[PDB]
């Protein structure tokens, strides 16, 4: 999409059965627990156009997904059936959508709203994982503030009532460091700059104590064969393996299948709890063959993943399943 993302946009959040305007001063910040509709009006190549992006946060509920479908059909009809329509799940945003925020990162908070609970309040201590893709599109995703949530490949922002830290993994890019700084501007906090390996005591204390975290030779590498994830299933009646594009999200791990994560110097074979034995056997055979055409093969089970695996994902919830 050659359009530059600087057209007029309106953003609404699904709240119950309605779409509700988002504060225009916070465009670019979204709750991961919610669904949104973005109406983007632009002009490119001498012609006007409109796109509706329907963005589904990773923790948004089925009720909100269904509500969004009604709301977008309504909007579509209101506009006379003119917009291009695009459905996007968190982590799978196209470059064009990432460009709508003036070069700022997409910031994804924990929580959101629901019919029952209303708007959740922010935690007093917060941790965000800041990751950029190869193209430079940057996401700052809120996670639980524990030492184990860190990964060497990315930048992190840690905000507490009394302090703020910008932790920079050895593998973190300048886009990630910049994105972390933009997040800190939104949080209205001035950071202590912390490099991986020289953390001050206050940093670990703020996280509830020092602990091992998500690291490996490849996670620590700054240069970047960037890791590829594959879904392995025999559900269609024969065994096949296909790639999972976009940012690597925990939801991409199919609990009824086997997943291959190739980090180049290692291939993980992740076994879903409801996957059949044959899917593991064939995934192991396929992985060995991939490797041999041109390296550890590490088997991991759902719910028992090692930090070296979990570090490649953008956010991880220990109680996801
Ligand atoms: Ca919600
Ligand atoms: Ca990174
Ligand atoms: Ca299966």
Coordinates of C-alpha atoms and ligand atoms in Angstrom, one line a residue:
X1 CA 0.0 0.0 0.0
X2 CA 2.0 3.0 -1.3
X3 CA -0.2 5.4 0.7
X4 CA 1.9 7.0 3.5
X5 CA -0.4 6.6 6.4
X6 CA -1.0 10.3 7.1
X7 CA -4.6 10.4 6.1
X8 CA -7.5 11.1 8.5
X9 CA -8.3 8.3 10.9
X10 CA -11.1 7.6 13.4
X11 CA -10.7 4.8 15.9
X12 CA -13.5 3.2 17.9
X13 CA -13.3 0.5 20.6
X14 CA -16.0 -2.2 20.8
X15 CA -17.7 -1.8 24.2
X16 CA -20.5 -4.3 24.5
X17 CA -22.7 -3.9 21.5
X18 CA -21.4 -0.4 20.5
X19 CA -18.4 1.2 19.0
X20 CA -17.1 4.0 21.2
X21 CA -14.7 6.7 20.2
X22 CA -11.1 6.3 21.4
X23 CA -9.4 9.4 22.8
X24 CA -7.7 10.9 19.8
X25 CA -4.6 11.7 21.9
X26 CA -4.1 8.0 22.4
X27 CA -4.4 6.7 18.8
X28 CA -1.8 4.0 18.5
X29 CA -2.3 2.7 22.0
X30 CA -4.7 -0.3 22.3
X31 CA -5.9 -2.7 24.9
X32 CA -5.0 -6.3 24.0
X33 CA -8.2 -7.3 25.7
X34 CA -10.3 -5.4 23.2
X35 CA -11.4 -5.2 19.6
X36 CA -11.2 -1.9 17.6
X37 CA -12.4 -0.5 14.3
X38 CA -10.3 2.0 12.4
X39 CA -11.8 4.0 9.5
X40 CA -8.9 5.4 7.5
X41 CA -9.5 8.1 4.8
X42 CA -6.7 8.7 2.4
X43 CA -5.7 10.1 -1.0
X44 CA -3.1 8.5 -3.1
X45 CA -2.3 8.5 -6.9
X46 CA -4.9 11.3 -7.3
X47 CA -7.7 9.2 -5.9
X48 CA -9.5 9.2 -2.5
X49 CA -10.1 5.9 -0.7
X50 CA -11.1 4.5 2.6
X51 CA -10.1 1.4 4.5
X52 CA -11.7 -0.2 7.5
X53 CA -9.3 -2.1 9.7
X54 CA -10.9 -4.4 12.2
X55 CA -8.2 -5.1 14.8
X56 CA -8.7 -7.9 17.3
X57 CA -6.7 -7.8 20.4
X58 CA -5.1 -11.1 21.5
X59 CA -7.3 -11.3 24.6
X60 CA -10.5 -9.9 23.1
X61 CA -13.5 -12.2 23.8
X62 CA -15.8 -13.9 21.4
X63 CA -18.7 -11.5 22.4
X64 CA -16.5 -8.6 21.3
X65 CA -15.5 -10.3 18.0
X66 CA -19.2 -10.9 17.2
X67 CA -20.1 -7.3 18.2
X68 CA -17.4 -6.0 16.0
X69 CA -18.8 -7.9 13.0
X70 CA -22.2 -6.2 13.4
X71 CA -20.6 -2.8 13.9
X72 CA -18.4 -3.0 10.8
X73 CA -21.3 -4.1 8.6
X74 CA -23.2 -1.1 10.0
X75 CA -20.4 1.2 9.3
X76 CA -19.9 -0.3 5.8
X77 CA -23.5 0.3 5.0
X78 CA -23.5 3.8 6.5
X79 CA -20.6 4.7 4.1
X80 CA -22.5 3.3 1.1
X81 CA -20.4 0.2 0.7
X82 CA -17.3 2.2 -0.4
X83 CA -14.5 1.0 2.0
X84 CA -11.9 -1.7 1.6
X85 CA -12.3 -4.1 4.5
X86 CA -9.4 -5.8 6.3
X87 CA -9.5 -8.1 9.3
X88 CA -6.3 -8.1 11.4
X89 CA -5.4 -10.0 14.6
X90 CA -2.9 -8.6 17.1
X91 CA 0.7 -9.3 15.8
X92 CA -0.4 -9.8 12.2
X93 CA -0.8 -6.1 11.2
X94 CA 0.3 -5.1 7.7
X95 CA 2.9 -2.4 7.3
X96 CA 0.2 0.0 6.2
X97 CA -1.7 -0.2 9.4
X98 CA 1.6 0.1 11.4
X99 CA 2.2 3.4 9.5
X100 CA -0.9 5.1 10.7
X101 CA 0.6 6.3 13.9
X102 CA 3.2 8.8 12.7
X103 CA 6.2 6.5 13.1
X104 CA 5.2 5.8 16.8
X105 CA 5.1 2.2 17.9
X106 CA 1.8 0.4 18.4
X107 CA 1.4 0.0 22.2
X108 CA -0.7 -2.9 23.5
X109 CA -1.7 -2.7 27.1
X110 CA -2.9 -5.5 29.3
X111 CA -6.6 -5.5 30.2
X112 CA -9.4 -3.7 28.5
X113 CA -13.1 -3.5 29.0
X114 CA -16.0 -5.9 29.3
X115 CA -19.7 -5.8 29.9
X116 CA -19.3 -7.3 33.4
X117 CA -16.1 -5.7 34.7
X118 CA -15.9 -2.4 32.9
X119 CA -12.5 -0.7 32.2
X120 CA -9.6 -2.3 34.0
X121 CA -7.1 -0.1 35.8
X122 CA -3.4 0.0 35.1
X123 CA -1.0 -2.0 37.3
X124 CA 1.2 0.0 39.6
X125 CA 4.3 -1.8 38.2
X126 CA 4.3 -2.5 34.5
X127 CA 6.6 -4.3 32.1
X128 CA 6.5 -3.9 28.2
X129 CA 8.3 -6.0 25.6
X130 CA 9.4 -3.8 22.7
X131 CA 10.0 -5.7 19.4
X132 CA 10.5 -4.5 15.9
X133 CA 10.2 -6.7 12.8
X134 CA 12.7 -6.6 9.9
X135 CA 10.8 -3.7 8.2
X136 CA 11.1 -1.6 11.4
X137 CA 7.4 -1.8 12.5
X138 CA 7.6 -1.7 16.3
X139 CA 5.2 -3.1 18.9
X140 CA 5.4 -2.4 22.7
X141 CA 3.4 -5.2 24.3
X142 CA 2.6 -5.1 28.1
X143 CA 3.5 -8.3 29.9
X144 CA 3.7 -9.5 33.6
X145 CA 6.5 -7.7 35.4
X146 CA 8.7 -10.6 36.4
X147 CA 12.4 -11.1 35.7
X148 CA 11.6 -14.2 33.7
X149 CA 9.7 -12.2 31.1
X150 CA 12.8 -10.5 29.8
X151 CA 14.5 -11.6 26.6
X152 CA 17.9 -10.7 25.3
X153 CA 16.6 -9.9 21.8
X154 CA 14.4 -6.9 22.7
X155 CA 14.1 -3.7 24.7
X156 CA 11.9 -3.5 27.7
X157 CA 10.3 -0.7 29.6
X158 CA 9.8 -1.2 33.4
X159 CA 7.6 1.4 35.1
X160 CA 7.1 1.4 38.9
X161 CA 5.5 4.0 41.2
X162 CA 9.0 5.3 42.0
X163 CA 11.2 4.6 39.0
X164 CA 11.4 3.7 35.3
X165 CA 13.9 1.7 33.5
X166 CA 14.7 1.2 29.7
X167 CA 16.4 -2.3 29.7
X168 CA 18.2 -3.0 26.4
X169 CA 18.9 -6.6 25.5
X170 CA 22.2 -7.4 23.8
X171 CA 20.2 -8.3 20.7
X172 CA 17.9 -5.3 20.7
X173 CA 17.8 -3.0 17.7
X174 CA 17.7 0.8 17.5
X175 CA 14.1 0.7 16.4
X176 CA 13.3 -1.1 19.6
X177 CA 15.3 1.3 21.8
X178 CA 13.5 4.2 20.0
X179 CA 10.1 2.6 20.4
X180 CA 10.8 2.1 24.1
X181 CA 11.6 5.8 24.4
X182 CA 8.3 6.6 22.8
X183 CA 6.5 4.4 25.2
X184 CA 8.2 6.1 28.1
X185 CA 6.9 9.4 26.8
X186 CA 3.3 8.1 26.8
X187 CA 3.9 6.8 30.4
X188 CA 5.2 10.3 31.3
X189 CA 8.3 8.7 32.9
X190 CA 12.1 9.5 32.6
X191 CA 14.1 6.2 32.4
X192 CA 17.3 4.9 33.9
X193 CA 19.1 3.4 30.9
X194 CA 20.0 -0.2 31.7
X195 CA 22.1 -2.5 29.5
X196 CA 21.6 -6.3 29.8
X197 CA 24.2 -7.6 32.2
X198 CA 24.8 -4.4 34.2
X199 CA 21.4 -4.1 35.8
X200 CA 21.3 -2.1 39.1
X201 CA 19.8 -3.7 42.1
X202 CA 16.7 -1.5 42.0
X203 CA 15.8 -3.0 38.6
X204 CA 15.7 -6.5 39.9
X205 CA 14.0 -5.5 43.1
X206 CA 11.3 -3.8 41.0
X207 CA 10.7 -7.1 39.2
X208 CA 10.2 -9.0 42.4
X209 CA 13.8 -10.4 42.3
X210 CA 16.5 -11.4 40.0
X211 CA 15.8 -14.6 38.1
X212 CA 16.9 -16.4 34.9
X213 CA 15.1 -15.2 31.8
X214 CA 14.7 -15.8 28.1
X215 CA 18.1 -16.0 26.5
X216 CA 20.2 -18.0 24.2
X217 CA 23.1 -17.4 21.7
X218 CA 20.6 -16.6 19.0
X219 CA 18.4 -14.3 21.2
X220 CA 21.5 -12.3 22.2
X221 CA 22.6 -11.9 18.5
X222 CA 22.1 -8.3 17.3
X223 CA 23.1 -8.9 13.6
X224 CA 20.3 -11.2 12.3
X225 CA 18.0 -16.2 9.0
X226 CA 15.3 -14.7 11.4
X227 CA 13.3 -17.4 13.3
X228 CA 10.5 -19.1 11.4
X229 CA 7.5 -20.9 12.9
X230 CA 5.7 -23.8 11.2
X231 CA 2.4 -25.7 11.9
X232 CA 2.6 -29.5 11.6
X233 CA -0.7 -31.4 11.4
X234 CA -2.3 -34.4 9.9
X235 CA -5.8 -33.1 10.5
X236 CA -6.5 -32.7 6.6
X237 CA -5.9 -36.5 6.4
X238 CA -2.1 -36.4 5.6
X239 CA 0.9 -34.8 7.4
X240 CA 1.8 -31.3 6.2
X241 CA 3.9 -28.5 7.5
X242 CA 3.1 -24.8 6.7
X243 CA 4.7 -21.6 7.8
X244 CA 3.1 -19.1 10.2
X245 CA 3.8 -15.5 9.1
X246 CA 3.7 -12.3 11.2
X247 CA 4.9 -11.7 14.7
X248 CA 5.3 -14.9 16.7
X249 CA 2.4 -15.0 19.1
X250 CA 1.6 -17.6 21.7
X251 CA -1.9 -18.0 20.0
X252 CA 0.0 -19.3 16.9
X253 CA 0.9 -22.5 18.9
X254 CA -1.9 -24.9 17.9
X255 CA -2.6 -27.0 21.0
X256 CA -3.8 -29.9 18.9
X257 CA -0.8 -30.0 16.5
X258 CA 3.0 -29.9 16.6
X259 CA 4.9 -26.7 15.8
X260 CA 8.5 -26.2 14.5
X261 CA 10.4 -23.2 15.6
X262 CA 13.6 -22.8 13.5
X263 CA 16.0 -20.3 15.0
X264 CA 18.8 -21.5 12.5
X265 CA 21.2 -22.7 15.1
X266 CA 18.4 -24.8 16.7
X267 CA 15.0 -26.3 15.8
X268 CA 12.4 -26.6 18.5
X269 CA 9.6 -29.2 18.2
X270 CA 6.7 -27.9 20.3
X271 CA 4.2 -30.6 21.1
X272 CA 0.6 -29.5 21.7
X273 CA -1.2 -31.3 24.5
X274 CA -3.9 -32.6 22.1
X275 CA -1.6 -33.5 19.2
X276 CA -1.4 -37.1 18.0
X277 CA 1.8 -39.1 18.4
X278 CA 2.2 -39.4 14.6
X279 CA 2.4 -35.6 14.3
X280 CA 5.4 -35.5 16.6
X281 CA 7.1 -38.4 14.9
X282 CA 6.7 -36.9 11.4
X283 CA 7.7 -33.4 12.6
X284 CA 10.9 -34.9 14.0
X285 CA 11.6 -36.6 10.7
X286 CA 10.8 -33.5 8.7
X287 CA 13.0 -31.3 10.9
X288 CA 16.0 -33.7 10.5
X289 CA 15.5 -33.6 6.7
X290 CA 15.2 -29.8 6.5
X291 CA 18.5 -29.5 8.4
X292 CA 20.3 -32.2 6.4
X293 CA 19.6 -30.5 3.0
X294 CA 21.9 -27.7 4.1
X295 CA 22.0 -28.4 14.8
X296 CA 20.1 -29.4 17.9
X297 CA 16.5 -30.6 17.6
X298 CA 14.9 -29.8 20.9
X299 CA 11.5 -31.3 21.9
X300 CA 9.3 -29.1 24.1
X301 CA 5.9 -29.8 25.5
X302 CA 3.0 -27.4 25.9
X303 CA 3.1 -25.7 29.3
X304 CA 6.7 -26.8 29.9
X305 CA 8.6 -24.6 27.5
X306 CA 12.2 -23.5 28.2
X307 CA 13.2 -19.8 28.2
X308 CA 15.2 -20.3 25.0
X309 CA 12.0 -21.1 23.2
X310 CA 9.6 -18.6 24.9
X311 CA 11.9 -15.7 24.2
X312 CA 11.0 -15.7 20.5
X313 CA 7.3 -14.9 21.3
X314 CA 5.9 -11.4 21.7
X315 CA 4.4 -11.7 25.1
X316 CA 3.8 -14.9 27.0
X317 CA 1.1 -15.7 29.4
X318 CA 2.0 -18.6 31.8
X319 CA -1.7 -19.3 32.3
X320 CA -2.8 -18.9 28.7
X321 CA -4.0 -22.5 28.4
Ligands
LIG1 CA1 -12.4 -6.7 26.2
LIG2 CA1 14.5 -7.7 18.9
LIG3 CA1 -3.6 -32.6 15.3

